[PDB]
Amino acid sequence: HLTMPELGHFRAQGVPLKRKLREFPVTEDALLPVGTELGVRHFVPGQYVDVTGITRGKGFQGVMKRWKFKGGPASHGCSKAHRKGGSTGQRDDPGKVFKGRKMPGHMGAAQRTVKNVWVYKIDPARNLIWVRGQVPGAEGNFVFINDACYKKPDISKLPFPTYLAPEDEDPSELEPLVADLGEVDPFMLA
Amino acid sequence: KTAKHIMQIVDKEAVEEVRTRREIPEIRPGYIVQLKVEVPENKRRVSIVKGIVIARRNAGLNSTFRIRRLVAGVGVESMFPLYSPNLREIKVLDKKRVRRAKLYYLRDKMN
Amino acid sequence: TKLRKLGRHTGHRMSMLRTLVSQLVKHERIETTITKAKEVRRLADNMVQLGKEGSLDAARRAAGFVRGDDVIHKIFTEFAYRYKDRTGGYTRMLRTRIRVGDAAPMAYIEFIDRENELRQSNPPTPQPPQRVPLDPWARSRLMRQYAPPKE
Amino acid sequence: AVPKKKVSKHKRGIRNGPKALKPVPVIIRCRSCGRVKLPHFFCCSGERG
Amino acid sequence: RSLKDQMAKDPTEVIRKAVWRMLPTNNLRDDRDRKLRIFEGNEHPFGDKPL
Amino acid sequence: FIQMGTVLKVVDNSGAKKVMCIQALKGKKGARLGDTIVASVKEAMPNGKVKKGAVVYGVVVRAAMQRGRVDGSEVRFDDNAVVLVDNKDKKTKTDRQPIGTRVFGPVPHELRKKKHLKILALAQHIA
RNA sequence: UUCCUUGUCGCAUAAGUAGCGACCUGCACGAAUGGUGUAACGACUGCCCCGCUGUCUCCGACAUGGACCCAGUGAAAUUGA
RNA sequence: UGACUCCCAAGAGCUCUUAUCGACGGAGUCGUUUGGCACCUCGAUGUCGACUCAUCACAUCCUGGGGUUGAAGAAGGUCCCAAGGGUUCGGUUGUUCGCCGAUUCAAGUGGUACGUGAGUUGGGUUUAGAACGUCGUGAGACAGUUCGGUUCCUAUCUACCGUUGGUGUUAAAGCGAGAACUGCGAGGAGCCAACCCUAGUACGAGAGGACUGGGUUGGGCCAACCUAUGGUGUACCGGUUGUUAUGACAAUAGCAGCGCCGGGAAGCUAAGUUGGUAUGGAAGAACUGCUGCUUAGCGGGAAAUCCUUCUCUAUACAAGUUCUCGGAACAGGUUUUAGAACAGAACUUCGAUAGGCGAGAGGUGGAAGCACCGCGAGGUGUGGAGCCAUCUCGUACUAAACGAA
Ligand SMILES: [K+]
Ligand SMILES: [K+]
Ligand SMILES: [K+]
Ligand SMILES: [K+]
Ligand SMILES: [K+]
Ligand SMILES: [K+]
Ligand SMILES: [K+]
Ligand SMILES: [K+]
Ligand SMILES: [K+]
Ligand SMILES: [K+]
Ligand SMILES: [K+]
Ligand SMILES: [K+]
Ligand SMILES: [K+]
Ligand SMILES: [K+]
Ligand SMILES: [Mg+2]
Ligand SMILES: [Mg+2]
Ligand SMILES: [Mg+2]
Ligand SMILES: [Mg+2]
Ligand SMILES: [Mg+2]
Ligand SMILES: [Mg+2]
Ligand SMILES: [Mg+2]
Ligand SMILES: [Mg+2]
Ligand SMILES: [Mg+2]
Ligand SMILES: [Mg+2]
Ligand SMILES: [Mg+2]
Ligand SMILES: [Mg+2]
Ligand SMILES: [Mg+2]
Ligand SMILES: [Mg+2]
Ligand SMILES: [Mg+2]
Ligand SMILES: [Mg+2]
Ligand SMILES: [Mg+2]
Ligand SMILES: [Mg+2]
Ligand SMILES: [Mg+2]
Ligand SMILES: [Mg+2]
Ligand SMILES: [Mg+2]
Ligand SMILES: [Mg+2]
Ligand SMILES: [Mg+2]
Ligand SMILES: [Mg+2]
Ligand SMILES: [Mg+2]
Ligand SMILES: [Mg+2]
Ligand SMILES: [Mg+2]
Ligand SMILES: [Mg+2]
Ligand SMILES: [Mg+2]
Ligand SMILES: [Mg+2]
Ligand SMILES: [Mg+2]
Ligand SMILES: [Mg+2]
Ligand SMILES: [Mg+2]
Ligand SMILES: [Mg+2]
Ligand SMILES: [Mg+2]
Ligand SMILES: [Mg+2]
Ligand SMILES: [Mg+2]
Ligand SMILES: [Mg+2]
Ligand SMILES: [Mg+2]
Ligand SMILES: [Mg+2]
Ligand SMILES: [Mg+2]
Ligand SMILES: [Mg+2]
Ligand SMILES: [Mg+2]
Ligand SMILES: [Mg+2]
Ligand SMILES: [Mg+2]
Ligand SMILES: [Mg+2]
Ligand SMILES: [Mg+2]
Ligand SMILES: [Zn+2]
Structure with missing residues (x-):
């Protein structure tokens, strides 16, 4: 499944063959040796994360879908200009179209980040993370998960530089961990 | 494919988790069901809801069904998630013979 | 499955596909465009499977698709005996040439396991009983595997 | 909209430059029938058909 | 950008921009800019050259 | 969405029978269940507090458009109905005084979170 | 037919340079270049209401033919360089 | 001329010129008004208004920061700083304008050929028809009114939105490649309200009623997503009308441009659901103070400026870095989460990439055949039956290296 240069890179690093590679900038104290396995217990339930992925592809798209332009009337004499952009500038001053003018073109299949995505549940047996709401991308495609920049997690609670499980640990014995919501009913104090 | 397979496995386990704690009867279109509904928006107020099942969708843990009834002379339609924990008790009272899975013609019915 | 439109409205498209399957059953091998053959193979397999079921319901369903008494008789007798132990894959399609006139890529499509087939088919192998798959996590x-020593 | 000027041979040659044909990298010749063909094209079955 | 902020950012660019617009505008200009080696301090890698 | 031109039934005893909405007080697309609208009175009873042609405020208590709830449930009514509330004091932008004294028909659970507590107190049936 | 003028009053609308009914100050109506009405009639020009709707709030999905691509054939206005 | 700024200060302001103003008179600034000139265009530069899409200036309408007040507080007045983000829907009218109604934090003023018709309209105006009033002997006319009245163009260049192909970037294989980065630089993001606590506190005789700080709920805008909801779902399931055919029965098929109705999973989509509308640092606007002692220095200081979060970015020519390969990388074929072509991504036979087959889920809603009841239309049972758009799982039967290539 790999080209020979990629296979040689994996061979010379001494790691098993992987499907997707991604580089993450870290500070010096956060470095981990080559071959360290990272699980879903890197994150703590209740914390917020930033999720990055390649969005859904939409192909070549017009101004109405791409930029929420209003278009033209469906009747009252309108002549073959129902979904077009209308005017694209001013006349002779400036005598040109400015850069960044919203026009038709390719839409989607681009990298985007969703900030402050809330981690609901951690399943360490299956390495599954339940996280609230939408995440960019198609099913079966890869996404990248970092600490949230805006709602920064508590420093004293994160496993640093990662969660280091012992090898004497059974996959069957780990139970899923749910975010603690507290004991104050949000529907009963209002 | 593996992503959808994982979703199916997790949904199947979630459905079997709920059905071992609560008793949920089989609900078909045309059934007269009575149920107690807790509404957490209104200070967790519990009310008894009775009506005829007019629609159903099988979607695992997120299965839904729809109830049509009259409340003080005004027709009120309510959709509920079948495995919602705010449904305290569901009873089937009567079964009307119907020919279809969706009974949206009952909205146009005089009664 | 991607169901192709073939530049035809639904009535014309389904009539053409029914005629093509009937001609394929009658002649045992026809030449057409690669795209039409990629559409015809699925319906021809469905007709063979209807002949293998063999019931009155299967006969009535098949008589609503294929045209001709000889075609339905061939399906329910000769194809039923021939493909009796073959699970699926009763047809073979192979690209042959570029058509003069519109540069359409052409393909033979044929029923297999008969005299003068294009390639020798594998023996009809019955499917093993349904395996319960492993979990994606156990799989x-x-x-997990390493690079083979080739350096 | 009409062209404002005649297009020079230089600009026409620049435009038609990438549209030149390129040679096919792999060509198959059957040793039996002698047909010259691309990969994944059927010409002959073997003997004892 | 002010001169103070440019000096805080990269003081070699101040000299490079002063020299650049004093040179004739022709195709030899960037070749002459290639020969202008500016350093913010006293240290440079050309100590083996005949300075 | 209840918007400009929508004709609504009046389900209190303020004396008006039908109103036409002028605007939703909040929302570009219009008003959903539990929202407050500005309306003008089209039909009124001969002896009532509210006369035909008056500009009034009304709280939507029945809506034909389905409204989702916090646990995934939905509710939908057959028609569109309002309960008239006071609009002479425009600095009280909170729970408004109903003009009438009785409310007929079902009333949504949404009125508590939107703080229409007087209408919820006056209601007999809650759906 | 009234410039001033969106004259003023009334009906109507949440709001009506509109419409209808008034008034008379007719810039610059008026009795076969007919005056004033008028049932019936009008693909004539206004105004209001019910029904109805993607006209709109606010646009979405789908279907055919073009547009795209490949193989044949193969125009046009225009053009100082 | 107009708009705005300034100078003087009689007088108004209980006293008091300049808190707010300001007579008689003066000096400017701008280039939006009304105009003047007639230099460009009459071998053509198509109007006003609306629509669509905007962008700039700041003489700032809102939001942000201040000085002063004839500033107790609340609400204001006035001036200074500030262009980051905003600045509504309707009724009459062709209208711009303006009035009115309901809102809003506010509903700014101007430039862009009074921005924008090879982007849309065509209601007014401004050809030919007709009518009224008026003027003319008349043919006719009106700067008055009224009804009607063909809106062409396939984009060559610049610009702009996207997508690729080639090419420079000595390397040591005259080198050719696959990955993973850094980010010179560029773009994007930038809003507001109401309620509650602080607090019925400060202030005030009372009525009234805060600054600051912190929460909650909304609205708008932006970025995604499809679990559920709604719409659609033209090769899914069922019902049904007319007709033709399979002789009839039975069961179907064609056409009525899905024949028409009721449903409908996936996919797409918003009317649905999520996520943002931060943080920290630096320099600093009006203004504000401290040090000096005449030159100045220093501190604080805003929705503004520059980094930081987000996206692109080595054709960044001082052309960058790291790992790896060397029959490497491509190409071809089966496809797809990607897609106009191209490109990306998966798989390519020691292989589940597509088709088929089998099972399950999901949709539809109770097949045929047979039996029973009924004169019959029909009803009941066998039986959550039969069928299959999709999805998952199993499985090399077919096509992908069947490449003895
Ligand atoms: K007159
Ligand atoms: K007469
Ligand atoms: K007529
Ligand atoms: K000027
Ligand atoms: K001219
Ligand atoms: K301000
Ligand atoms: K002030
Ligand atoms: K403007
Ligand atoms: K125009
Ligand atoms: K032009
Ligand atoms: K040009
Ligand atoms: K759907
Ligand atoms: K049917
Ligand atoms: K028929
Ligand atoms: Mg719009
Ligand atoms: Mg539209
Ligand atoms: Mg036309
Ligand atoms: Mg059209
Ligand atoms: Mg120019
Ligand atoms: Mg999906
Ligand atoms: Mg250089
Ligand atoms: Mg007039
Ligand atoms: Mg009036
Ligand atoms: Mg009149
Ligand atoms: Mg006369
Ligand atoms: Mg006469
Ligand atoms: Mg007459
Ligand atoms: Mg061609
Ligand atoms: Mg002038
Ligand atoms: Mg000319
Ligand atoms: Mg200013
Ligand atoms: Mg104050
Ligand atoms: Mg602005
Ligand atoms: Mg009207
Ligand atoms: Mg208007
Ligand atoms: Mg203009
Ligand atoms: Mg303008
Ligand atoms: Mg133009
Ligand atoms: Mg055009
Ligand atoms: Mg006109
Ligand atoms: Mg005369
Ligand atoms: Mg006209
Ligand atoms: Mg046009
Ligand atoms: Mg940078
Ligand atoms: Mg969107
Ligand atoms: Mg969905
Ligand atoms: Mg779904
Ligand atoms: Mg649905
Ligand atoms: Mg029959
Ligand atoms: Mg026919
Ligand atoms: Mg016919
Ligand atoms: Mg048809
Ligand atoms: Mg349907
Ligand atoms: Mg539907
Ligand atoms: Mg300072
Ligand atoms: Mg500071
Ligand atoms: Mg480079
Ligand atoms: Mg592709
Ligand atoms: Mg498969
Ligand atoms: Mg079912
Ligand atoms: Mg049937
Ligand atoms: Zn051969």
Whole structure:
């Protein structure tokens, strides 16, 4: 499944063959040796994360879908200009179209980040993370998960530089961990 | 494919988790069901809801069904998630013979 | 499955596909465009499977698709005996040439396991009984492997 | 909209430059029938058909 | 950008921009800019050259 | 969405029978269940507090458009109905005084979170 | 037919340079270049209401033919360089 | 001329010129008004208004920061700083304008050929028809009114939105490649309200009623997503009308441009659901103070400026870095989460990439055949039956290296 240069890179690093590679900038104290396995217990339930992925592809798209332009009337004499952009500038001053003018073109299949995505549940047996709401991308495609920049997690609670499980640990014995919501009913104090 | 397979496995386990704690009867279109509904928006107020099942969708843990009834002379339609924990008790009272899975013609019915 | 439109409205498209399947059953091998053959193979397999079921319901369903008494008789007798132990894959299609006139890529499509077939088919192998699959996590645990020593 | 000027041979040659044909990298010749063909094209079955 | 902020950012660019617009505008200009080696301090890698 | 031109039934005893919405007080697309609208009175009873042609405020208590709830449930009514509330004091932008004294028909659970507590107190049936 | 003028009053609308009914100050109506009405009639020009709707709030999905691509054939206005 | 700024200060302001103003008179600034000139265009530069899409200036309408007040507080007045983000829907009218109604934090003023018709309209105006009033002997006319009245163009260049192909970037294989980065630089993001606590506190005789700080709920705008909801779902399931055919029965098929109705999973989509509308640092606007002692220095200081979060970015020519390969990388074929072509991504036979087959889920809603009841239309049972758009799982039967290539 790999080209020979990629296979040689994996061979010379001494790691098993992987499907997707991604580089993450870290500070010096956060470095981990080559071959360290990272699980879903890197994150703590209740914390917020930033999720990055390649969005859904939409192909070549017009101004109405791409930029929420209003278009033209469906009747009252309108002549073959129902979904077009209308005017694209001013006349002779400036005598040109400015850069960044919203026009038709390719839409989607681009990298985007969703900030402050809330981690609901951690399943360490299956390495599954339940996280609230939408995440960019198609099913079966890869996404990248970092600490949230805006709602920064508590420093004293994160496993640093990662969660280091012992090898004497059974996959069957780990139970899923749910975010603690507290004991104050949000529907009963209002 | 593996992503959808994982979703199916997790949904199947979630459905079997709920059905071992609560008793949920089989609900078909045309059934007269009575149920107690807790509404957490209104200070967790519990009310008894009775009506005829007019629609159903099988979607695992997120299965839904729809109830049509009259409340003080005004027709009120309510959709509920079948495995919602705010449904305290569901009873089937009567079964009307119907020919279809969706009974949206009952909205146009005089009664 | 991607169901192709073939530049035809639905009535014309389905009539053409029914005629093509009937001609394929009658002649045992026809030449057409690669795209039409990629559409015809699925319906021809469905007709063979209807002949293998063999019931009155299967006969009535098949008589609503294919045209001709000889075609339906061939399906329910000769194809039923021939493909009796073959699970699926009763047809073979192979690209042959570029058509003069519109540069359409052409393909033979044929029923297999008969005299003067294009290639020798594998023996009709019955399917093994349904296996319960492993979990994706157990499978992922078994899929981990290193680079072979080739340096 | 009409062209404002005649297009020079230089600009026409620049435009038609990438549209030149390129040679096919792999060509198959059957040793039996002698047909010259691309990969994944059927010409002959073997003997004892 | 002010001169103070440019000096805080990269003081070699101040000299490079002063020299650049004093040179004739022709195709030899960037070749002459290639020969202008500016350093913010006293240290440079050309100590083996005949300075 | 209840918007400009929508004709609504009046389900209190303020004396009006039908109103036409002028605007939703909040929302570009219009008003959903539990929202407050500005309306003008089209039909009124001969002896009532509210006369035909008056500009009034009304709280939507029945809506034909389905409204989702916090646990995934939905509710939908057959028609569109309002309960008239006071609009002479425009600095009280909170729970408004109903003009009438009785409310007929079902009333949504949404009125508590939107703080229409007087209408919820006056209601007999809650759906 | 009234410039001033969106004259003023009334009906109507949440709001009506509109419409209808008034008034008379007719810039610059008026009795076969007919005056004033008028049932019936009008693909004539206004105004209001019910029904109805993607006209709109606010646009979405789908279907055919073009547009795209490949193989044949193969125009046009225009053009100082 | 107009708009705005300034100078003087009689007088108004209980006293008091300049808190707010300001007579008689003066000095400017701008280039939006009304105009003047007639230099460009009459071998053509198509109007006003609306629509669509905007962008700039700041003489700032809102939001942000201040000085002063004839500033107790609340609400204001006035001036200074500030262009980051905003600045509504309707009724009459062709209208711009303006009035009115309901809102809003506010509903700014101007430039862009009074921005924008090879982007849309065509209601007014401004050809030919007709009518009224008026003027003319008349043919006719009106700067008055009224009804009607063909809106062409396939984009060559610049610009702009996207997508690729080639090419420079000595390397040591005259080198050719696959990955993973850094980010010179560029773009994007930038809003507001109401309620509650602080607090019925400060202030005030009372009525009234805060600054600051912190929460909650909304609205708008932006970025995604499809679990559920709604719409659609033209090769899914069922019902049904007319007709033709399979002789009839039975069961179907064609056409009525899905024949028409009721449903409908996936996919797409918003009317649905999520996520943002931060943080920290630096320099600093009006203004504000401290040090000096005449030159100045220093501190604080805003929705503004520059980094930081987000996206692109080595054709960044001082052309960058790291790992790896060397029959490498491509190409071809089966496809797809990607897609106009191209490109990306998966798989390519020691292989589940597509088709088929089998099972399950999901949709539809109770097949045929047979039996029973009924004169019959029909009803009941066998039986959550039969069928299959999709999805998952199993499986090399077919096509992908069947490449003895
Ligand atoms: K007159
Ligand atoms: K007469
Ligand atoms: K007529
Ligand atoms: K000027
Ligand atoms: K001219
Ligand atoms: K301000
Ligand atoms: K002030
Ligand atoms: K403007
Ligand atoms: K125009
Ligand atoms: K032009
Ligand atoms: K040009
Ligand atoms: K759907
Ligand atoms: K049917
Ligand atoms: K028929
Ligand atoms: Mg719009
Ligand atoms: Mg539209
Ligand atoms: Mg036309
Ligand atoms: Mg059209
Ligand atoms: Mg120019
Ligand atoms: Mg999906
Ligand atoms: Mg250089
Ligand atoms: Mg007039
Ligand atoms: Mg009036
Ligand atoms: Mg009149
Ligand atoms: Mg006369
Ligand atoms: Mg006469
Ligand atoms: Mg007459
Ligand atoms: Mg061609
Ligand atoms: Mg002038
Ligand atoms: Mg000319
Ligand atoms: Mg200013
Ligand atoms: Mg104050
Ligand atoms: Mg602005
Ligand atoms: Mg009207
Ligand atoms: Mg208007
Ligand atoms: Mg203009
Ligand atoms: Mg303008
Ligand atoms: Mg133009
Ligand atoms: Mg055009
Ligand atoms: Mg006109
Ligand atoms: Mg005369
Ligand atoms: Mg006209
Ligand atoms: Mg046009
Ligand atoms: Mg940078
Ligand atoms: Mg969107
Ligand atoms: Mg969905
Ligand atoms: Mg779904
Ligand atoms: Mg649905
Ligand atoms: Mg029959
Ligand atoms: Mg026919
Ligand atoms: Mg016919
Ligand atoms: Mg048809
Ligand atoms: Mg349907
Ligand atoms: Mg539907
Ligand atoms: Mg300072
Ligand atoms: Mg500071
Ligand atoms: Mg480079
Ligand atoms: Mg592709
Ligand atoms: Mg498969
Ligand atoms: Mg079912
Ligand atoms: Mg049937
Ligand atoms: Zn051969």
